[PDB]
UniProtKB/Swiss-Prot annotation, chains A, D:
Superkingdom to which the source organism belongs: Eukaryota
Cellular component, GO annotation: axon; cell periphery; cytoplasm; dendrite; extracellular exosome; filopodium; growth cone; intercellular bridge
PTM comment text: Some glutamate residues at the C-terminus are polyglutamylated, resulting in polyglutamate chains on the gamma-carboxyl group. Polyglutamylation plays a key role in microtubule severing by spastin (SPAST). SPAST preferentially recognizes and acts on microtubules decorated with short polyglutamate tails: severing activity by SPAST increases as the number of glutamates per tubulin rises from one to eight, but decreases beyond this glutamylation threshold. Glutamylation is also involved in cilia motility.
Gene that encodes it: TUBB3
Residues where GDP binds: 10-12, 15, 99, 138, 142-144, 177, 204, 222, 226
Location(s), subcellular: Cytoplasm, Cytoskeleton; Cell projection, Growth cone; Cell projection, Lamellipodium; Cell projection, Filopodium
InterPro entries reported for this sequence: Beta-tubulin_BS, Beta_tubulin, Tub_FtsZ_C, Tubulin, Tubulin/FtsZ-like_C, Tubulin/FtsZ_2-layer-sand-dom, Tubulin/FtsZ_GTPase_sf, Tubulin_C
Tissue: Expression is primarily restricted to central and peripheral nervous system. Greatly increased expression in most cancerous tissues.
Species name: Homo sapiens
The protein's name in its UniProt record: Tubulin beta-3 chain
Residues annotated for GTP binding in this entry: 11, 69, 138, 142-144, 204, 226
SMART domains attached to this UniProt entry: Tubulin, Tubulin_C
UniProtKB/Swiss-Prot annotation, chains B, C:
Cross-link Glycyl lysine isopeptide (Lys-Gly) (interchain with G-Cter in ubiquitin) placement: 317, 361
Gene (UniProt): TUBA1B
Organism this protein belongs to: Homo sapiens
Domain notes for this protein: The MREC motif mediates interaction with TTC5/STRAP and may be critical for tubulin autoregulation.
Protein name: Tubulin alpha-1B chain
Post-translational modifications reported in the UniProt record: Some glutamate residues at the C-terminus are polyglutamylated, resulting in polyglutamate chains on the gamma-carboxyl group. Polyglutamylation plays a key role in microtubule severing by spastin (SPAST). SPAST preferentially recognizes and acts on microtubules decorated with short polyglutamate tails: severing activity by SPAST increases as the number of glutamates per tubulin rises from one to eight, but decreases beyond this glutamylation threshold. Glutamylation is also involved in cilia motility. Some glutamate residues at the C-terminus are monoglycylated but not polyglycylated due to the absence of functional TTLL10 in human. Monoglycylation is mainly limited to tubulin incorporated into cilia and flagella axonemes, which is required for their stability and maintenance. Flagella glycylation controls sperm motility. Both polyglutamylation and monoglycylation can coexist on the same protein on adjacent residues, and lowering glycylation levels increases polyglutamylation, and reciprocally.
Oligomeric form and interacting partners: Heterodimer of alpha- and beta-tubulin. A typical microtubule is a hollow water-filled tube with an outer diameter of 25 nm and an inner diameter of 15 nM. Alpha-beta heterodimers associate head-to-tail to form protofilaments running lengthwise along the microtubule wall with the beta-tubulin subunit facing the microtubule plus end conferring a structural polarity. Microtubules usually have 13 protofilaments but different protofilament numbers can be found in some organisms and specialized cells.
Database matches in Gene3D superfamilies: Helix hairpin bin, Tubulin/FtsZ, C-terminal domain, Tubulin/FtsZ, GTPase domain
Subcellular localization, as worded in the UniProt entry: Cytoplasm, Cytoskeleton
Positions with a binding annotation for Mg(2+): 62
Family per similarity comment: Belongs to the tubulin family.
Triggers of expression: Autoregulated by feedback control of mRNA degradation. In excess of soluble tubulin, TTC5/STRAP cofactor triggers cotranslation degradation of tubulin mRNA.
Database matches in PROSITE patterns: TUBULIN
Entry EC number(s): 3.6.5.-
Length: 425, 431, 431, 425
């Protein structure tokens, strides 16, 4: 019932997906060997949305791990929770596409996407009522960006009515981890605009800021960043899964935050983020959670909402809390920041409340924000893309793989249309 | 003999039904397993043994709330086949609950309601519990009401709806769902007793000393209102009032059928100890603008009909004196075309206190259903929000790509404008 | 005195007989070894001591099912000589069961049936349990029925046949066997109570909450139907109905003799607890199109005869009121040449619950045998499938190389066309 | 009762027969010395169809091992379960016929077929009620193809009313194990068309695909392939042997899958095929078995059913399962694949259900398919045959053994008639 197919593409996607399945198994009380060792019945009440029951009551995640290099597959398999995924769902190639969008979308992406599409078709036909798909990847990468894009397009043309939502790691503003990041990001965004229902844009530098300033982590590794992203994913599909006072699945959130088809890029967030030192001085209340989630420092994308206006927001609360406090905090937030919300949408907040909090917490909440400040991120990508494209730098790789400059022009025109739409609204 | 069927749609409706049926079981002495260690006939049916099955359906498009009902303390009270549930909810979308997801469930719900009606002898009508700003609480409620009007085109259909609050709100697309539901059900409804979560929050804070109430306390208060409304069917009193009495005395014109619910003795234990709550006091509390359970100031409009439902140790002479005092008041103004705007019902059964609740045990209580033109301001606010969101055309793609057309949006807005015009016309004095 | 012989042919017939005789032993208090720790005379015979031998034969062309019977818990109930078996089955081939393999066994079966008839004093008739789409259930059943008509040319021959389902099917050559059996037995049968596996699957899922039923549950339901049919012979009631009563009241014309079986109180334990199943409720359930055990919508045709067999705590006045209510219904339409289309039988013995079954213990039950023109659509589907397969001439070599001719195929198809024409003619209103 | 005479011809036939008798003895609890060491009485209830009771309650398989070379006889005798067969049923010659159909059918096949016919007559006259015969052989071989053909013809003209069904290993599409494979295969098929009731065409390359992709066998040997073929044979005659809810012998299957006399070539299959790694993640249910058996990857012949239309199928289920689930799965399969089933045969599925599952399993099922995709295999054989025959390659061997080119022309004409009939239907 309302089964979700999870696809992890590339190194970033595979690592974030491994952390995501760790936190999900923690929520549902699933042993790293696949056995249920939980305590409450609500964990197995809706285990079907993410897991498939095998023969000996062992739960196999409904996840497809796709990459163009075997190193990440070996790392995921060898580590903890690596004996959890189905061994037939590791679909990988040998050559790793470099950091080339064209390689991952046109040359090796073809064979690997045929194989992964067969696997995805099997997984979907196994499902009872498919709610939709979720993809984890990075736009600035190689196999990640291009292959996630190709899979998104093909699954979309196969299943147009399902909800396709992606948790994509966007390029950072200050320091880039890939020289050709603008090209891959621009092409990936051009493809994501038309074939995705919900794109949660995550930047690693905002995550570094959160870890250093809010969690006071001296040496934040990728494990902590992936844990944060996994907590966001958790929160959303937990509103989907567990019982609550005000339920909301993926489609309800999509309806309440996508006023127009192309305006589906969100800044995620997580409210109860405290350092180990300050956990004893802070009161965990709905006002505290709301004040933190609406703070511009907590948002997981390096886009200041004070530079734009919130088209819509979604607050997915978790835990036993009073609906009056949630609604009054929402009203106070809208009244105080009336200049930061769009006037032509009254009640720009969609509230969902789930009864089961995450492990180790009494209250929690995730913030999703459809704001016109993503236009800043797309503008940065556009300036970098046009700076490299004007002098035609690193372009012979993409051209030789089989692309054309016309595709680059179309991608940049589509992204400029996106920024124009955001600025207009 | 005077059997009535209660229908609970959506999460709000199902939880309010949980509170209501807990209250009914406590009032009639029925254990939560249906057994008792007549009065209990308009709402319960006897199956051979002491088992009393409530005469209700719990319908939702989401398995979560219904499954909570199925595994709770009342797991063995409800008939398992009358707890109807879907697989995917309407996701705060009217089109999903009315056209796409609601069409796969409406036949089962109608079959179960037909079974319940056949089991009855004389069907007084239906009680529909739902929320205005929900997916299945709007779309499926409208679809079900229209199908019931097609089938039972003569039985009364009273609906207890959670009107969206003026300021607090849990969903972003509430104006769309509310306007579309008002259109569709206004075509096919008798009277809608309205309530607001914000107003009940204020009532709880001011009267019950609760600073952190949940939906549970709100549902308990609403269940007290429903119990006061249905006491005449369930018990014996000096002045009995049926559902048709509500419909006749509260609805002056076919479209103006949105009364507001009120409950006077909302008081904590200590305050109840320190007070001498009498008929005059509870009546004055009912007409106090701060005790309204819909956040609309009655002084902004004119009353057209009031239904005072007293219960417990109530004397008719005291009721008459209190109503005369209310009529002599100058802050409380009525429309000039209703010289007699009071339907009075008196019941001999005092309200039952739920163990674990916040309401104190009282000797008498009154529920006031008031049809007033102050709801016109709330309608104006709702259609203003609808107009903003529709002018920007926000969220419209979600509704359109689910079996609806923008023409329906325009038609619903025009119908709401006509309703506002009707309220304005009935407001003005005759010359 | 009113002894009747039941004949079970094929795997379906033998397993349904297993269920039926388990039910009979439970009803009459007979232990599975034939001993008891009259009523038990129309179906059992006493041999000196308390040993009660059932008055039945179990005939199959395959040793497997009969050997399961021979070694089961009822190994010592049946006479070893009345469990007749062959060596090689008919392999879903009508010709094998009728011409080639059935001719080597028919003499033994007739000898055993003659022994049983001689042991009887007054033989009411035969009950033939078989399946339409099986080899020995079709060919051997037709051969046996024709031989019985030659021998016992006056005793009634009622057959309980598993009609092929509209969609689900376990064999590929079912239309051939079904058409040929219908031809041959329609020449030589009184009335055939029909049932579908698909319809019983739907009934089990909807009513008994079973999501994975086996053939065992289907056989238990069919055995309940047979017990309700034969209760009048086995017990005492207000209105007794014999086999000849069935034949007279259900067969208007010699060829139109295919009623459909129904059973109203198909309900689980918890649902039975929550319900108050009465005569009116069970009658309405019987006439519900979703409770038919043959997957044919009765609203597509006209009833020509109904046989309501009530049993248990049933009052004749309640039955009359329920039947009057059914007649006043407009969805249930009868042919215009049958102003009285109800044969009513009432028995004092409530249905017996099998330990380990799914049916709950009830105080009353009704079995409804309805002859209707809605079976004409099922016949049309069956002959359409036959026409496709015969136009391609598929599988015809299997039948021809086994003692049959293609002329028999053509003749059987023409006879089925004539039967469809007869159903169409009896359907139309008189002018 | 319903005794079956099993004849193994050639190396392929003898090895597959050895594996078959191993699995059959496992099913019936027969010691490799011939003694019954089982637990249930159903094993001895129908032991007679395959075994003959000897003096000291020792069960001798009703099998004739015929080959034109003594190496396979020695290998079978020396290995485990080799002291099980009657020593008088090893009928072998010295010269191994090479890979020549003519040698095995006309020169040495004559003497050896007289001897094996005497043995078969003795075995049949010993029987109480002969159900039929079964032959294991390879069409691309030497003694196997030609001698199995000659034995089939002679036994058929001796016992025309019995069921003669063969499990023949057909040539593979990609790689051939014999240079003269098309000649032997064409002649063998020309003889099999008229003298056989049920030919189960098995290709080694489909078996390799099953072992590598479905069973994840790193080094699949002929033991595993022979085990698969033996499981298919088991399933069929187990429907014959053990008690069930819906019985079906060899003749019932023959009636339900042979619409026309010459259309009796089937693609076998086996549903519960799982790798040792995935046995814990998979739910063993009737829908799972049906989905696997109807999958084009599971079928044991390299002929894609999506390139043709199923004339008929047979599903022989084993184990305690619900008949409603079986019938509903059959109906769903027919409805979903309505384009892959013949329209002029309604209900193209014949269902049999046995109560006793194979050892080590809870549920099982075998799939037999009379499809018009065997025409692809016969077409490949025809192209290869005509390619070699046009230039008259390797033909002097067949001519010198005593054949004629007219026989080759008749064989290819008959096979072309077979492909014409399949394409027509």
């Amino acid at each position: 019932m309302r089964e979700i197919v999870h696809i992890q593409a590339g190194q970033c996607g595979n690592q974030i997906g491994a952390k995501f399945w760790e936190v999900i198994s923690d929520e549902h009380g699933i042993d790293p060997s696949g056995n249920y060792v939980g305590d409450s019945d609500l964990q197995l009440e809706r285990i079907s949305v993410y897991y498939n029951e095998a023969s000996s009551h062992k739960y196999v995640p409904r996840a497809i791990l796709v990459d163009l290099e075997p190193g990440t597959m070996d790392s995921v398999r060898s580590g903890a929770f690596g004996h959890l995924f189905r061994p037939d769902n590791f679909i990988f190639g040998q050559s790793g596409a470099g950091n080339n969008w064209a390689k991952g979308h046109y040359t090796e992406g073809a064979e690997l996407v045929d194989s992964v599409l067969d696997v995805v078709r099997k997984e979907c036909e196994n499902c009872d009522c498919l709610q939709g798909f979720q993809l984890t990847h990075s736009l600035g990468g190689g196999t990640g960006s291009g292959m996630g894009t190709l899979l998104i397009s093909k699954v979309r043309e196969e299943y147009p009515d399902r909800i396709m939502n992606t948790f994509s790691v966007v390029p950072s503003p200050k320091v880039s981890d890939t020289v050709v990041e603008p090209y891959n990001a621009t092409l990936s965004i051009h493809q994501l605009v038309e074939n995705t229902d919900e794109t949660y844009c995550i930047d690693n530098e905002a995550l570094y800021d959160i870890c250093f300033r809010t969690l006071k982590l001296a040496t934040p590794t990728y494990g902590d960043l992936n844990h944060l992203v996994s907590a966001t994913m958790s929160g959303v599909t937990t509103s989907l899964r567990f019982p609550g006072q005000l339920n909301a699945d993926l489609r309800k959130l999509a309806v309440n935050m996508v006023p127009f088809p192309r305006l589906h890029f969100f800044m995620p967030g997580f409210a109860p983020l405290t350092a180990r030192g300050s956990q004893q001085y802070r009161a965990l209340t709905v006002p505290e959670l709301t004040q933190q989630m609406f703070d511009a420092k907590n948002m997981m994308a390096a886009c200041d909402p004070r530079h734009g206006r919130y088209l819509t927001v979604a607050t997915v609360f978790r835990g036993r809390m009073s609906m009056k406090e949630v609604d009054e905090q929402m009203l106070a937030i809208q009244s105080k920041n009336s200049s930061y919300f769009v006037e032509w949408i009254p009640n720009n907040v969609k509230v969902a409340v789930c009864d089961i909090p995450p492990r180790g917490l009494k209250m929690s909440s995730t913030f999703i924000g459809n704001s016109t400040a993503i236009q800043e991120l797309f503008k940065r990508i556009s300036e970098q893309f046009t700076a490299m494209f004007r002098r035609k730098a690193f372009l012979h790789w993409y051209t030789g793989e089989g692309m054309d400059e016309m595709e680059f022009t179309e991608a940049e025109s589509n992204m400029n249309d996106l920024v124009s739409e955001y600025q207009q609204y | 003999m005077r059997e009535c069927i209660s229908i609970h749609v959506g999460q709000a409706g199902v939880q309010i039904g949980n509170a209501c049926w807990e209250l009914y079981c406590l009032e009639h002495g029925i254990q939560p397993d249906g057994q008792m260690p007549d009065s209990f006939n308009t709402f319960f049916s006897e199956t051979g043994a002491g088992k009393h099955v409530p005469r209700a359906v719990f319908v939702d498009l989401e398995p979560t709330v219904i499954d909570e009902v199925r595994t709770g303390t009342y797991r063995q009270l409800f008939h398992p086949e009358q707890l109807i549930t879907g697989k995917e909810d309407a996701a705060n979308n009217y089109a999903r609950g009315h056209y796409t997801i609601g069409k796969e469930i409406i036949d089962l719900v109608l079959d179960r309601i037909r079974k319940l009606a056949d089991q009855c002898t004389g069907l007084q009508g239906f009680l529909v519990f739902h929320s205005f700003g929900g997916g299945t609480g709007s779309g499926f409620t409208s679809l079900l009401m229209e199908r019931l009007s097609v089938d039972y085109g003569k039985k009364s259909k009273l609906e207890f709806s959670i009107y969206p609050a003026p300021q607090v709100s849990t969903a972003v697309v509430e104006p769309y769902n509310s306007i579309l539901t008002t259109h569709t059900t206004l075509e096919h409804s008798d009277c809608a007793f309205m309530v607001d979560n914000e107003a009940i929050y204020d009532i709880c804070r001011r009267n019950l000393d609760i600073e952190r109430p949940t939906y549970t306390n709100l549902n308990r208060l609403i269940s007290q209102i429903v119990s006061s409304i249905t006491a005449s069917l369930r018990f014996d009193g000096a002045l009995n009032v049926d559902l048709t009495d509500f419909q006749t005395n509260l609805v002056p014109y076919p479209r103006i059928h949105f009364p507001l619910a009120t409950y006077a003795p909302v008081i904590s234990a200590e305050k109840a100890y320190h007070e001498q709550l009498s008929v005059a006091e509870i009546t004055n509390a009912c007409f106090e603008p701060a005790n309204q359970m819909v956040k609309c100031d009655p002084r902004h409009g004119k009353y057209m009909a009031c239904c005072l439902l007293y219960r417990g140790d109530v004397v008719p002479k005291d009721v008459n004196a209190a109503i005369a005092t209310i009529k002599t008041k100058r802050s409380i103004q009525f429309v000039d075309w209703c010289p007699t705007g009071f339907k009075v019902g008196i019941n001999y059964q005092p309200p039952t206190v739920v163990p674990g609740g916040d309401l104190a045990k009282v000797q008498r209580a009154v529920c006031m259903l008031s049809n007033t033109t102050a709801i016109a301001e709330a309608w104006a606010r709702l259609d203003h929000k609808f107009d903003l969101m529709y002018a920007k055309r926000a969220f419209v793609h979600w509704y359109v790509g689910e079996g609806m057309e923008e023409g329906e949006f325009s038609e619903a807005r025009e119908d709401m404008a006509a309703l506002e015009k009707d309220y304005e016309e009935v407001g003005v004095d005759s010359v």
